[PDB]
Structure formats: C-alpha cells, structure tokens
C-alpha cells in the first residue's frame, strides 16, 4: 500500500508546511492591520490635539 504511505506523509507534510506558514504569514498581516488600528487611534488623537 504505497498509497497509505503517500497519504500518511502527504497529509502531514503538505498541510503542516502550508498551513503553519499561513498561520504565521497572516499573523504578520494581522499585526500590521492591528498597527493600522493603532495608527487610527493616533490619527484620532492628533486630530483632537490640533
């Protein structure tokens, strides 16, 4: 059953690599969007200060 071996590894290797990468890639996108939220907070504070 070469297929069980192909599947046992394909399931794990293709997914752990692609999936964990999406977790951290998006974590950075999300952190940047969170920075945008901070920058909007900053923008709101600056408009009020002016």
């Amino acid at each position: 059953l070469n297929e069980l071996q192909a599947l046992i590894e394909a399931h794990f290797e293709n997914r752990k690599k692609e999936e964990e990468e999406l977790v951290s890639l998006k974590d950075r996108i999300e952190r940047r969007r969170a920075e945008r939220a901070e920058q909007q907070r900053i923008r709101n504070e600056r408009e009020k200060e002016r």
Binding site: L4, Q5, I8
Partner: peptide, 29 residues
C-alpha cells in the same frame, strides 16, 4: 488516519492468516 485504517487491515490480514493457521494447526490434531 486512513494510513492506519489501511495498516490495520494489513496487520489484520497478517494475523487473521496466522490465526487461521493457529486454529488449523490445532484443529488438524
């Protein structure tokens, strides 16, 4: 865990065959 649903079947066959023989070997007297 299909890899082991399949490994299970292979080992199940290996033991079932060994078992078939255990049973026959005793049955043969």
């Amino acid at each position: 865990m299909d890899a082991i649903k399949k490994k299970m079947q292979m080992l199940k066959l290996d033991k079932e065959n060994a078992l078939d023989r255990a049973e026959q070997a005793e049955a043969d007297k």
